[PDB]
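Practice record 12: protein with sodium ion.
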Amino acid sequence: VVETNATVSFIIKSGESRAVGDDLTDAKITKLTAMVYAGQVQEGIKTVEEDGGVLKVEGIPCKSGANRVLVVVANHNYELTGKSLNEVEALTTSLTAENQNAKNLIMTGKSAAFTIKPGSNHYGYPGGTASDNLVSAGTPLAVTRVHAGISFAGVEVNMATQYQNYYSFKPADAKIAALVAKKDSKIFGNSLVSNTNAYLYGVQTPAGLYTPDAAGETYELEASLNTNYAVGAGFYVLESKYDASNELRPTILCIYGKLLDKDGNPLTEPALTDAINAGFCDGDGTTYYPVLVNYDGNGYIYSGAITQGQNKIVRNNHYKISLNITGPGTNTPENPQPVQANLNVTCQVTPWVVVNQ
Ligand code: NA
């Protein structure tokens, strides 16, 4: 069973990084496990670890034959030796605190089926490469993050004329949080969206339409999904299909903090209660400005990879939100507004690259 008569080498797809003023940066592979499968059976496996980044793997021992597949998992915390293909493809990941320090940002890739010949085989190497069997020439293997990213590129406040005498908001004093974030996902599949109904929040807020509180849904605090506001600050998150169930479950990025009076002091009575009962803030004066990420609605403008919201989170996309606040927020960011929130959004959607080096 252990005898081999071939090696496989491959190149990983990489690109020019032009990510600059954002915390959530492009991918760098520091740990990679490459496997060769013949149907369900793992016929080769090699793990490499390089702090400087991995862009190719050479000389993986394996067995010649038809219809082999290269399966890759990177930046991971799994034990993969000997697993069947079914086992590997059933692996999940979950959002954890270390993900927000860019640790265990799982990446995967999988080739189409190809023939391995005896001797030295090369997958995704350049055209004309010296080989006993060159496959996928000029198309390196795509090994990509399972996580997406959501961040604020910027938040500005320009209170509309009707609110200028009544309210102010200071983003420098604010926090940001993810709401209605899927807890888990698959790591292989046409879509990574899991059928669990488990979600996370960075800050507890009142139940509304978007809150996962229907039968079988769970909704738990994850403190790593809140941070202070700063330009480019945000969160790694997982795939989600917003309309998978009977009620919408949009992943939300929100900024929240004190709704102040026109002079930047706390609201006092009666202005405080006027604002609370209008739905703007809670008893402490806290107001929320939610953005439904990649939602088709609410006047949101999109550029980059898309110009229309898709009502989902897709792996390896960085959703960079520029928010303009023009009025008081809401005390219930997990409800839709009856008319329209006092905010405008432009969102640049940029896929991450694997940094070339
Ligand atoms: Na509900």
